[PDB]
Design an enzyme around this catalytic site. Structure first.
Site, PDB file in Angstrom:
ATOM      1  CG  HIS A 190      96.371  63.244   4.494  1.00 19.19           C
ATOM      2  ND1 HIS A 190      95.876  63.765   3.409  1.00 19.19           N
ATOM      3  CD2 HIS A 190      97.176  64.074   5.154  1.00 19.19           C
ATOM      4  CE1 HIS A 190      96.564  65.013   3.103  1.00 19.19           C
ATOM      5  NE2 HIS A 190      97.011  65.248   4.186  1.00 19.19           N
ATOM      6  CB  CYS A 239      96.471  68.759   3.557  1.00 15.48           C
ATOM      7  SG  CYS A 239      98.283  68.441   2.866  1.00 15.48           S
ATOM      8  N   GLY A 288     101.099  71.470   5.806  1.00 14.80           N
ATOM      9  CA  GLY A 288     100.253  72.337   6.520  1.00 14.80           C
ATOM     10  C   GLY A 288      98.998  72.636   5.504  1.00 14.80           C
TER      11      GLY A 288
END
Ligand SMILES: Cc1ccncc1NC(=O)Cn1ccc2ccc(Cl)cc21
Ligand SMILES: Cc1ccncc1NC(=O)Cn1ccc2ccc(Cl)cc21
Lengths: 304, 304
Positions: free
Chosen positions: A41, A145, A143
């Site tokens: 993503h 991830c 943030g």
């Protein structure tokens, strides 16, 4: 003495954390050898998350669109591929700090340490368990991830989790390092409710053994039970069924303490039926289920 | 979202851990620049611990009696001195992995991370608080002495604790990096009972603010209180008195949540008087006091 929720030392993983930016999205990457692993993503905008077609979105991306920064220096991206829900960015430089490693897919009830990162930089380390509903109860903000979960056996880091998302209920979902989600979650901003968060019975028993080893013995009773009798009670309290495999794994703790596994099951049964009565066990007022039998043995023996 | 007992990333401290052996005693050392810091009881035998005269014992020791091993390589000891309860072993090689550092002496209620080590090797990392009775509730076994506590502000490691001993009650005592014990403890195998372990009220309030930020709001009530009224209740429950300094430190959390500090004090008052009624807050059935207001802000903002 003393029993703490202990994480693995994080240095070996800190040397792998990088920042990955694609367009206006910045998240964390894991740099092992000449490959940087990150959630797919990273190619999306927040608007794209509602219904993303990752193969189509990826077509509009080239090697130069993935900005990878390790500390303060830029890595050159010479290839990119999508493997399930992760992107693999081949860089021209092998990570000099690459530890010995493996990618493993853990089972529910298994514990691991998380190195929470933001912009490729580590913020903290904590211990998690893969819940029976395949969520993790972590501590992650926007943030985070690309932050990873791992175990360590002497010098080998077994990476088992990469963070991808927070569910509307504040629990967390992610993948193994091959990009396959744990549980039925998908990397899309859609209604994804988690199943029942049952208690990891074998871990609670391991933690009761840790308490006995450390002096907290008030909950030991004069009773015993059977696997079937215990499991009737465990069903009633949303506890995972205890198998003979679990009894076998508890063998070393039973041997060290001289308390038969079924006798500890009877103590746990009374704790479930009667509660703690305002008392604590290892400084907790609830039954802790995020220490495996291996974690208890490890912490109680001092493996480094 | 999610709130975890988070430790600082430990890599910077892992690069400092060494093994110190003197005679038949082996413990951990902290290697910063060309000095290795370790507990002075490394010169003792277990028999010596009953009534050790450290100056006298140290006279029988020379530079070559201190065996310092960093990883698998031996460091050459060119000097040794005793500073309070720590030995400083000057080595001929500056630690190439020396991070930016400071030695700080923390106050009770302050939290820090511990890198538990055995034979100079890290086993795990966990978060502690210096208790109001100057003990720490750690997880340490024989051989863990010399393991250190620390905080990190971006790239500077502030070392605040070095582990020395376990009290007969299973709690832990140690020094700052100048060798001064926290509390009244002495490095001798003698009767040392700890004082009252009171609850760090300001940290409990910080953790109640963290719970509100993360969605656990059931304990918020329709009441307020005063510092004096709250403190009468806090006295009754062995909670530390709350000062206007503590109220000031909670200011940013009060501002973020829109809940006045005295209103949160009233929620805490009802929680103390009525208990949790079988309910939990941030997955805990008791009031957590080992997160400072700074730890809450840090974790809830993602400082790296
Ligand atoms: C904000 C935050 C806090 C904690 N842990 C992770 C995040 N970030 C996200 O969840 C980002 N993000 C938003 C929508 C969405 C859908 C799917 C997937 Cl994979 C990621 C998604
Ligand atoms: C066994 C263990 C477990 C956890 N944390 C530390 C230890 N080790 C010790 O306490 C060693 N040791 C024994 C007697 C004595 C007296 C004074 C001092 Cl400073 C050290 C002493």
């Amino acid at each position: 003495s003393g029993f703490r929720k202990m994480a693995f030392p994080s240095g070996k993983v800190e040397g792998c954390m990088v920042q990955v930016t694609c367009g206006t999205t910045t998240l964390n990457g894991l740099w092992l050898d000449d490959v940087v692993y990150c959630p797919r993503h990273v190619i999306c905008t927040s608007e794209d998350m509602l219904n993303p077609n990752y193969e189509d979105l990826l077509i509009r991306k080239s090697n130069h669109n993935f900005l990878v920064q390790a500390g303060n220096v830029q890595l050159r991206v010479i290839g990119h591929s999508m493997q399930n829900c992760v992107l693999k960015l081949k860089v021209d430089t092998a990570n000099p700090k690459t530890p010995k490693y493996k990618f493993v897919r853990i089972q529910p009830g298994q514990t691991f340490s998380v190195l929470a990162c933001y912009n490729g930089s580590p913020s903290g380390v904590y211990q998690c368990a893969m819940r029976p509903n395949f969520t993790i109860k972590g501590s992650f903000l926007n943030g985070s991830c690309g932050s990873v979960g791992f175990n360590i056996d002497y010098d080998c880091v077994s990476f088992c989790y990469m963070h991808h998302m927070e569910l509307p209920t504040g629990v967390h979902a992610g993948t193994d390092l091959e990009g396959n989600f744990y549980g039925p979650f998908v990397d899309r901003q859609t209604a994804q409710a988690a199943g029942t968060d049952t208690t990891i019975t074998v871990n609670v028993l391991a933690w009761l053994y840790a308490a006995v080893i450390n002096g907290d013995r008030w909950f030991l009773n004069r009773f015993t039970t059977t696997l079937n009798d215990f499991n009737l009670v465990a069903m009633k309290y949303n506890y995972e069924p205890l198998t003979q495999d679990h009894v076998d794994i508890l063998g070393p703790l039973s041997a060290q303490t001289g308390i038969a596994v079924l006798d500890m099951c009877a103590s746990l049964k009374e704790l479930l039926q009667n509660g703690m009565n305002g008392r604590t066990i290892l400084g907790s007022a609830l039954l802790e289920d995020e220490f495996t039998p291996f974690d208890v043995v490890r912490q109680c023996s001092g493996v480094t």
